[model samples]
Target: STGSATTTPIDSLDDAYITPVQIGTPAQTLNLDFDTGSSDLWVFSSETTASEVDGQTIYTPSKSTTAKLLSGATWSISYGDGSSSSGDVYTDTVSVGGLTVTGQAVESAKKVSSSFTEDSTIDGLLGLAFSTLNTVSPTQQKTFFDNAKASLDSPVFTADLGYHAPGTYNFGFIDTTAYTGSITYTAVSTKQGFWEWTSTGYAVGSGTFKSTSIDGIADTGTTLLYLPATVVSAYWAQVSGAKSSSSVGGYVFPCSATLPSFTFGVGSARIVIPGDYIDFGPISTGSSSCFGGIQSSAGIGINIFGDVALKAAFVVFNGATTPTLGFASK
Candidate 1:
């Protein structure tokens, strides 16, 4: 849940869709974010009266004929950033992309903060990330992927990190046809999902680094790419025309219109990133000017390859069977 492009989660102006899943039946449909950071499935319900959160989609059991609520327990999770919320646990018939799969897991938000409620879009988050990392650890730690693997026709699971483009989070299938070429698979280190490795070095527009130390992880949860201060500085320094200004924990700067192609070395392979992907959004803020992909992290440790890095690529996260995260083009 770390390597997202934007610091803020993607808030959709339009409603996203999700189907409910029942514990006893195979009918599944639920509009939810397939978040890879935490492990839990959540949506709004008819009894959601603590103050209605707006924008995104919601799943009201009363609206779906297939939803089944499990009266046995409550569900809750706090994000890695320390933001927290709690809710009741439920199981109902859910469906996604017209493909119905029964016994889907979901959580209903009983409480949320004002800031979260305002910019928020979705009614709930489906914990598709690391299941064992939940706040309510020891007792209720499991991921949606762990459960869905049983119901899928093929064991291979693919997530089209369709962050920028409008789309719904799908489960159980590897739809490579959505992109142009073959799916590229990187061996996830035999460790936890946190992809830790030695970055051999970096290449800015085919130019080699003066040579330095690098260690980072490619996170899907984070919106902005997080790099160490040294690396971030080193990155900007490489761009000949790159002039920087401060913003957030990161920096923004102006560079020659013709920015160079960049790549992050992983010893095994070089991850290529085009120039267009580095350019920031249209909003201008003086010094930083518009924006560029590589920015700063408050020295929070770990170099993050956020969604911005994945923007130009079709990210196929296949944690279906192992810790080695997989990536592909879209």
Candidate 2:
């Protein structure tokens, strides 16, 4: 079958996106961050430390008749930004949109980092990356998409992330109306368990497209776009009063500075990210300096095409034997 769900930005800055998910038999609904950068379907639950429970909706496995403990199973995961969570595992009925997956591995958070506790809008994370990245020990667990792929009409899922608006995540089928123009397909390297692909080139604003290859991952979980230092420098150089500040961390520019659009190639197709989208937001409340949406991935090892880039186009994550990624303008 197929499934479709609306994902809404958590705040005005679009710091993150969340989608409603139903867990347990009676279905305790919680708003979870649909993260394509990692693999592990974890949630804040009754097992979590009381002090760590902010305003998040907790999943109570005991309340579900269909819930079954996955004995001796446990999981722990940490993100690039340093946020982390860990806990025991339980297999229960989990559903996203209208697609149901029985006996889905649901990692119940026993401990969570302060970052997660402070984010009241996000109850947990639903990882959409390949199952190879699952942190479950002893027995690796398949992601919700992986478990549901065989039963789906097609083994593919699409992400249509938005700027300050609500978008969608569709499983099993692509919504033709969701995008315009023909899709540009590219090979995906799952060796690192990410939707990793190589971008053909990039252009700064209306400049000529540079013929270069930049390897990166399509990560919806991340808030910004990260590219090579050279590319990042070129883009920032075009903006007046922009500087790479260590104190503020990363690149920051005057709030009133005129920002230029960024364009990246996907095969022969080029997707343009509007200038307004790159003006991430102010570095602080009432501050005149703003953080850039694009930064250097020098220390990151691999570049990340996060929400900043994903929001510019419709993306497809095909989970076939030999996986591939598709990009289209919307």
Candidate 3:
């Protein structure tokens, strides 16, 4: 079996991608962020505190006859940005596109941080990372992908993110027409429960390709591309007015600055991010200075190849017994 879903960017900068998901027997539709950086199929629901509910749609388990409380099951998750959510768990029938899974663990949120409440664009998160990362207590649960993979024609899924536009998430097979050139496949380490891989090297604009192994994760949930300080400094150095800012919280520069394209290697393959993608909009509305989409990952602990980089290519997450990741320019 296979399935396909359209994922739309929530903002002009493509901060995150949201996809429609159907839950319960009556099919309560909710727009969810399909996050590859974490594992926990959680959502804002009837159980959430009234104060925490913003403009997000909520899932009402009472309306779904198929919903069954897990009794003692509970979950909690925290992000790098300090946002967090936690609640009870319920098993229900869930569907993404046309792919259905019976008894999928659906976490119902009872509490959420201020950031989650403020982001009205997303109702919840559908985690696609390794199931080992699930935070469910007593017995950890499998992710939607992990449970659906066995039924798929090919145990793989693909992410084709777009810049300021809707993209696609395909399960069971790869859409050949979605990308250009041959794909470069690399081994993925699931030990950390992320789609972690190593890039062979990188290049700034038309500069030389620095030969260095950069370990990072392909995280669709994150908004920016974070690299080593050396690489980030090298890229920003090419821009005339760019500087690392303490007040603004990252590398920022004049909105009119001519940014350089960034290229990263996957084995012998090279994927280039267009210069315009790095101009992550103004720091604030009507401001002349813009925050850079590429930043230093020193504080983050792990380098992230987020939407800024993912939008430049088509990615395949192969879920075979021995997992692998594939990248192809789009």
Candidate 4:
């Protein structure tokens, strides 16, 4: 789940080089990605050299009315995927949707290579799901929703993430009429990032995988779905046409047939992954060779059930009280 978020980092978001909104000022308008995979929001800065940056949002502090550096305090940002960045901290007026907040934590990254330099046009990230993803010191736990939760018409809210759809990124007062209206929450686990749910195993059509002891947590920040090697290998064993990408750890399978749907027992809840999600975007370019389901991760920990699984539910992670999460059909 690459889009559902409940918290954010102190960063700027300017749609990573698209039409960017100036940084600072509650009046500013910017398109920020809400990532639940990690708790950090970063925006590009003036100190960044144009040559080393990628296509992410930019934060123009000098162009704003309210922007101040945090006394040159060195900040360290880390990601679950073995990526890190270092920079200075800053505070400024920020706005998303129509809500505004004063002194939201913002990171000014000065050193980032690879994806940072290439995708540096995005203004900043809005880690909107939980506060644990905040990379700053003291870990400011106040999220945009923490400030605006009281204003919501419903005690609970829903995120119907569009396919990077323009204008589908609505903030506040989720349109209720659009849902078939299913809301079921699960209890939060004892860990920080791991939200607990009953053992609802997964399988992807013909090359499906299943596990007797495996469980899953829906995360929005991750790009691909993760699973245990044993479980993934089990499903791939049945794939009609399976192949591995030598460069990448993820595998690809060929089989367009109507594969059987897998089932899992989530407490009293029984959930089945629909066949449509089995495809998971289009396969690589070839002579119509379809790939397998699970992606290979040689060194990444935390098997995240990314956006692919979340697209099936309207999940809510409640950290305001006890750690508990609920899921429902959107």
List lDDT for all candidates, in order: 0.53, 0.95, 0.95, 0.52
Q: How many angstroms is residue 114 displaced in model 2 relative to the true structure, after the best TM-score fit? A: 0.5
lDDT tens readout by residue for model 1, 23-117: 22333333454555556766655555547566644556655565666666676666644556667755564444434445555566777655446
When 1 and 2 are scored with lDDT, the better candidate is 2
Better of 3 and 4 by lDDT: 3
- lDDT of each residue in 1-330, candidate 2, tens digit only: 999999999999899999999999899999999999999999999999999998999999999999999999999999999999999999999898899999999999999999999999999999999999999999999999999999999999999998899999999999999999989999999999999999999999999999899999999999999999999999999999899999998999999988999999999899999998998778889999999999999998999999999999999999988999999999
RMSD (Cα, Å) for all candidates, in order, is: 5.7, 0.6, 0.7, 5.8
lDDT score, candidate 4, position 297:
40
**Candidate 2: residue pairs that collide:** none
Put down candidate 3 lDDT per residue, 119-178, tens digits, no spaces. Answer: 998999999999999999989999999999999999999999999899999999999999
What are the TM-scores, per candidate, against the unseen true structure?
A: 0.73, 0.99, 0.99, 0.75
Q: Give the lDDT of residue 59 in candidate 1.
A: 53
In angstroms, how far off is 327's CA in candidate 2?
0.4
Using alpha carbons, what is the TM-score of model 2? 0.99
Q: With candidate 2 superimposed using the best TM-score fit, by how many Å does residue 292's alpha carbon deviate from the native?
A: 0.5
lDDT tens readout by residue for model 4, 1-330: 011223332222111112222348635555555665555556666665566566555577776678777664555666665556667777777655445556666677777656555453345555655555465664453445444455544334344443233223334444545445555556656365555454555554543345455556556655545667765665565566665667544676554644344444344444455544445433544435544435544455556666545544555655445656555554
Q: Is candidate 1 or 2 superior in TM-score?
A: 2
